Design a protein around this ligand. Structure first.
Ligand SMILES: *[C@@H]1O[C@H](CO)[C@@H](O[C@@H]2O[C@H](CO)[C@@H](O)[C@H](O)[C@H]2NC(C)=O)[C@H](O)[C@H]1NC(C)=O
Ligand SMILES: *[C@@H]1O[C@H](CO)[C@@H](O)[C@H](O)[C@H]1NC(C)=O
Ligand SMILES: *[C@@H]1O[C@H](CO)[C@@H](O)[C@H](O)[C@H]1NC(C)=O
Ligand SMILES: *[C@@H]1O[C@H](CO)[C@@H](O)[C@H](O)[C@H]1NC(C)=O
Ligand SMILES: [Zn+2]
Lengths: 195, 596
């Protein structure tokens, strides 16, 4: 009946760090996927399991608009069966992922000539991320064999690094505002519909 | 958790912090060089002091991961380059003396001035007061004045400093386990742990001398031919079997003979190819110059210039009030930001240099995937030679004809090719004995073979025997004539210029063979050859992650530096020189002197 708050996930003033990927569970509203274009310099719309062409034909039990920021090089990592710092330790997608990936260059917003250190990723983690997990833990990461005692230092590196998006950066290092649209499909009434 | 895995993680944190800080140091240096003001000066000092302090810190945390227990050569190469101590190994007092002497010498040279003898009010800096006399004047005593005064005013002051410079630089090397400072400098070419591609530091001296042996006959003919023409323009002064006086060589020292083209041109009636005038008629600007350069690299299969490159680079002098350092430089700031700072005029020289500096950018873009510590040329001599081969192809009559700067009605005869080759040989071949002898003298000074009271005596002995160049005025051991050159009194290794020369002709000969060029090597244009660009690229993308010997083999098919392509390029001039020197003496004598 009411419009799904895609304006929220796709036009929010601030998105998220990828390590704390923010999900807006979508339900009982009307989905109008054609609106999804903000006239951005580098737009990607890969979809898996579902068909992006005429995406406003399929009901789902839920839609999970996971939003974050990463640099351009790592955008490809937001995809099934990928590897690298993002998908390994920050935000993994499953093998048979059934949804969509929508990213766009945001150097206009999230860069600063002094450097925007607000957006973080997770440089080290002890075990690879099970699909759609989130590790918001600041556990001082023990790389060596002596316990780290919750204080950083030798082989005790802090597990989160900043990006420092400056505007003079390159396309593969500029901030890119990713929006995953995980389409859940359970036995439930599947209230997420709409042409 | 082994120690190789701790080093693997230590380098991972480093690679992300180092990329961030080096980006601030590069962007602070870029803002200074593009806008020079006293406020920009201050920030280049701050970011450059934070980056110098972060590197200094990280080295100590790295010495805890022993290189022996690390087996992945990529990790070893990063730690080895990070574990460098340098000045640090010296006491906090000696590490402060050395930094003072290096600062004082660099200021004595750059600010070094000599004033007219007749007019003690009129003084001249080396650039552009004395360098201007050396290049363009054709008097004898006016050249002898500037050549002597520079070495007697600037050089004599540097002499006590260079003696202490040698002593401390050795103690730095002997505490990083090198034999001497020269051995420390030769560590740039060293390779260990890769069987079949290893390269010892001592091997460089064998290579450099053995290769220079093959250069000798060409140089002896270029020297004899140059001497004969010089003997006809300075009749009473130059002997037909003696060395060339050091001040008649085109510049302050004789590093390049390029300025002697006016007096040595074989067929001075036939003009030189100067597309400068054609660029003005077609309304070319700097935008077009780099676009035509960007076109050249696309044609061989290399990627176009980054969108940031056009937005942030400085392709013209901003002029007016915003001043800048106009020395052409390519900037790899990192994080995808590439930039060229060139005060371009619409001339042919800048057209070719834009190709040369953009070659540096293409090299930098290529290995941009590599880890931070491995983003560099395979050795020192790679990076310059990758840019030089760009200006080799771009300046050919073929490329000029294919871009519409040279009309297809212009015809190349065997005489303009001889004019072309000789102007190259004055620049290229002429610097090889100068470069090899200078780095030989410094190498022998550091090893201790030349005592202090024989410094200037062994210098001018070796200048006669190797370079075939004689001083016009005798010098005692209060001079330091090497120190009168920038690269000597400013602590820069010099053999890179010899190795770079031989590298570039190895590349160009290999790239043209892949491009199926037919004819002499000096006529070749690698344009449109994607096979050539591919061959070059698979070395460009390696960076420092491979031994330079493997990098050299991925282009030219040989593991070692060779001189034959250099000879092959210059052969048409060589057999012609063997003709013009038919009834002239080939060789020189080391005991003649214009000072009796
Ligand atoms: C740089 O200096 C460090 C510190 O001096 C060197 O590492 C030390 O070497 C001494 C040699 O007597 C050992 O006793 C120490 O255990 C070492 N470690 C530390 C933390 O001091 C390091 O070898 C030097 N690097 C190079 C390349 O010379
Ligand atoms: C999203 O925000 C931009 C900038 O504020 C605005 O131009 C655009 O109209 C917005 N789009 C929607 C659908 O609200
Ligand atoms: C060394 O490390 C790199 C990067 O992790 C890896 O690709 C390479 O395979 C390693 N070396 C060997 C011999 O496997
Ligand atoms: C660059 O130099 C000019 C001098 O004309 C100065 O006015 C300007 O402020 C400088 N740039 C910046 C970003 O301040
Ligand atoms: Zn260069």
């Amino acid at each position: 009946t009411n419009l799904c708050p895609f304006d929220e996930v796709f036009n929010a003033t601030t998105f998220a760090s990828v390590y704390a990927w923010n999900r807006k569970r979508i339900s009982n509203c009307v989905a109008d996927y054609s609106v999804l274009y903000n006239f951005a310099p580098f737009f990607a719309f890969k979809c898996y399991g579902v068909s992006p062409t005429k995406l406003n034909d399929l009901c789902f039990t839920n839609v999970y608009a996971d939003s974050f920021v990463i640099r351009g090089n790592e955008v490809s990592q937001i995809a099934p069966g990928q590897t690298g710092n993002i998908a390994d330790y920050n935000y993994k997608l499953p093998d048979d992922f059934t949804g969509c990936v929508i990213a766009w260059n945001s150097n206009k917003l999230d860069s600063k000539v002094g450097g925007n250190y607000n957006y973080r990723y997770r440089l080290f983690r002890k075990s690879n991320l099970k699909p759609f997990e989130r590790d918001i833990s600041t556990e001082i990461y023990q790389a060596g064999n002596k316990p780290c005692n919750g204080v950083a230092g030798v082989n005790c590196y802090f597990p989160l690094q900043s990006y420092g998006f400056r505007p003079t950066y390159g396309v593969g290092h500029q901030p890119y505002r990713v929006v995953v649209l995980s389409f859940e499909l359970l036995h439930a009434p599947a209230t997420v519909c709409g042409p | 958790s082994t120690i190789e895995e701790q080093a693997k993680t230590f380098l991972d944190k480093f690679n992300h912090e180092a990329e961030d800080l080096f980006y601030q140091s590069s962007l602070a240096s870029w803002n200074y060089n593009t806008n020079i003001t006293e406020e920009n000066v201050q920030n280049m000092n701050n970011a450059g002091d934070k980056w110098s302090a972060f590197l200094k810190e990280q080295s100590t945390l790295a010495q805890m991961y022993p290189l022996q227990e690390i087996q992945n050569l990529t990790v070893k190469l990063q730690l080895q380059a990070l574990q460098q101590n340098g000045s640090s190994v010296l006491s906090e007092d000696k590490s402060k003396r050395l930094n003072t002497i290096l600062n004082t010498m660099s200021t004595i040279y750059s600010t070094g001035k000599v004033c007219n003898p007749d007019n003690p009010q009129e003084c001249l800096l080396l650039e552009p007061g004395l360098n201007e006399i050396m290049a363009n004047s054709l008097d004898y005593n006016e050249r002898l004045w500037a050549w002597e005064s520079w070495r007697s005013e600037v050089g004599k002051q540097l002499r006590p400093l260079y003696e202490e410079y040698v002593v401390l630089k050795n103690e730095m090397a002997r505490a990083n386990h090198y034999e001497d400072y020269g051995d420390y400098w030769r560590g740039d070419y060293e390779v260990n742990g890769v069987d079949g591609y290893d390269y010892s530091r001592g091997q460089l001296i064998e290579d450099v001398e053995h290769t220079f042996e093959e250069i000798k006959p060409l140089y002896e003919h270029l020297h004899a031919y140059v001497r004969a023409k010089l003997m006809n323009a300075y009749p009473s002064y130059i002997s037909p079997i003696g060395c060339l006086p050091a001040h008649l060589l085109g510049d302050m020292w004789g590093r390049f003979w390029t300025n002697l083209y006016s007096l040595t041109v074989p067929f001075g009636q036939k003009p030189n190819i100067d597309v400068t005038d054609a660029m003005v008629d077609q309304a070319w600007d700097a935008q077009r110059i780099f676009k035509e350069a960007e076109k050249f690299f696309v044609s061989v299969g290399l990627p176009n210039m980054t969108q940031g490159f056009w937005e942030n680079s400085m392709l013209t002098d901003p002029g007016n009030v915003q001043k800048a350092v106009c020395h052409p430089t390519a900037w790899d700031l990192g994080k995808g930001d590439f930039r060229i700072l060139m005060c371009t005029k619409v001339t042919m020289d800048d057209f070719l240099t834009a190709h040369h500096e953009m070659g540096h950018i293409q090299y930098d873009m290529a290995y941009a995937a590599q880890p931070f510590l491995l983003r560099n040329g395979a050795n020192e001599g790679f990076h310059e030679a990758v840019g030089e081969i760009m200006s080799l192809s771009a300046a050919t009559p073929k490329h000029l004809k294919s871009i519409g700067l040279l009309s297809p009605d212009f015809q190349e005869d065997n005489e303009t090719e001889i004019n072309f080759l000789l102007k190259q040989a004055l620049t290229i071949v002429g610097t090889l004995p100068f470069t090899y002898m200078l780095e030989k003298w410094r190498w022998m000074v550091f090893k201790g073979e030349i005592p202090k009271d024989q410094w200037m005596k062994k210098w001018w002995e070796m200048k006669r025997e190797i370079v075939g160049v004689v001083e016009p005025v005798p010098h005692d051991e209060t001079y330091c004539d090497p120190a009168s050159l920038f690269h000597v009194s400013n602590d820069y290794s010099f053999i890179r210029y010899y190795t770079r020369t031989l590298y570039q002709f190895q590349f160009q000969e290999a790239l043209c063979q892949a491009a199926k060029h037919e004819g002499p090597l000096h006529k070749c244009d690698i344009s449109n050859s994607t096979e050539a660009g591919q061959k070059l690229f698979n070395m460009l993308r390696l960076g420092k992650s491979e031994p330079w010997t493997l990098a050299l083999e991925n282009v030219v098919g040989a593991k070692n530096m060779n001189v034959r392509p250099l000879l092959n390029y210059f052969e048409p001039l060589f057999t012609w020189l063997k003709d013009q020197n038919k009834n002239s003496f080939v060789g020189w004598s080391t005991d003649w002197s214009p000072y009796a």
